[PDB]
Amino acid sequence: PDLKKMEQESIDQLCELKKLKQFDIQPDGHSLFASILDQLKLRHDPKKLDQDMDVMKLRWLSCNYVQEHRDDFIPYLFDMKMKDIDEYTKEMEHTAQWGGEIEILALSHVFDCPISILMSGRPIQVYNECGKNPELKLVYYKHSYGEHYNSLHDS
């Protein structure tokens, strides 16, 4: 029922009201990490950031934060049966599989920042509503095709 254009049109007007601007993050399996990387290089202090930070290293940081804070990520893997917390980290770190809510909350605590996800038909979600570092602003598309993320610049 052309839900792709319907979601894009609502997101377009949503950022117009929020004074935000969309990016063109390539919609492959690294969209979430690339959008977070772009938001880090845009809103974070460059003197306090790893300049050589790339996608697969953010893939390594999220997977290690889950491995050392496993109890904080167990509830995000049940409901059927439960996905093995360890096997989930080895497949997310070495492949190009789509990242989700687990990688957002993990990286939000890794960099001590809020990470906002803008969606159409939903209020803004803010992960780590409390990080002292500047908030990263992302946008999620459900119908633009599975989990595609993009970066949000100012104005």
Nearest-10 Cα torsion for 136, 34, 51, 64: 90
C-alpha–C-alpha distance, residues 113 and 12, integer Å: 25
Residues before each break in the chain (C–N > 2.5 Å)? 79, 145
Domain interval for residue 72:
3-154
CATH number at residue 123: 3.90.70.80
C-alpha–C-alpha distance, residues 114 and 127, integer Å: 5
C-alpha–C-alpha distance, residues 155 and 144, integer Å: 23
Q: Which two tokens stand for residue 57?
A: 């290293």
Q: Which two tokens stand for residue 103?
A: 């990688």
Experimental approach: X-ray
Cα 76–80–83 angle (5° rounding)? 45
Are the CB atoms for 141 and 11 separated by under 8 Å?
A: yes
Nearest residue to 103 via CA among 54, 33, 44: 33
C-alpha–C-alpha distance, residues 107 and 119, integer Å: 19
Three-state secondary-structure class, residue 118: strand
C-alpha–C-alpha distance, residues 23 and 73, integer Å: 29
C-alpha–C-alpha distance, residues 130 and 137, integer Å: 14
CB atoms within 10 A of CB 28: 11
Please name the amino acid found at residue 36: I
CB atoms within 10 A of CB 122: 10
Number of domains in the chain: 1
What is the CA 87 to chain-centroid distance, rounded? 21
Alpha-carbon torsion (123, 98, 110, 102), positive or negative: positive
Which value in Å is the resolution of this experimental model?
A: 2.6
SS3 of 30-99? CHHHHHHHHHHHHHCCHHHCCCCCCHHHHHHHHHHHHHHCHHHCHHHHCCCCCCCHHHHHHHHHHCCCCC
| In the block, residue with structure tokens 């509830």 | 75
For residue 19, give the DSSP letter. T
For residue 141, give the DSSP letter. E
Q: How far is CA 149 from CA 73, 98, 123, in A?
A: 21, 10, 16
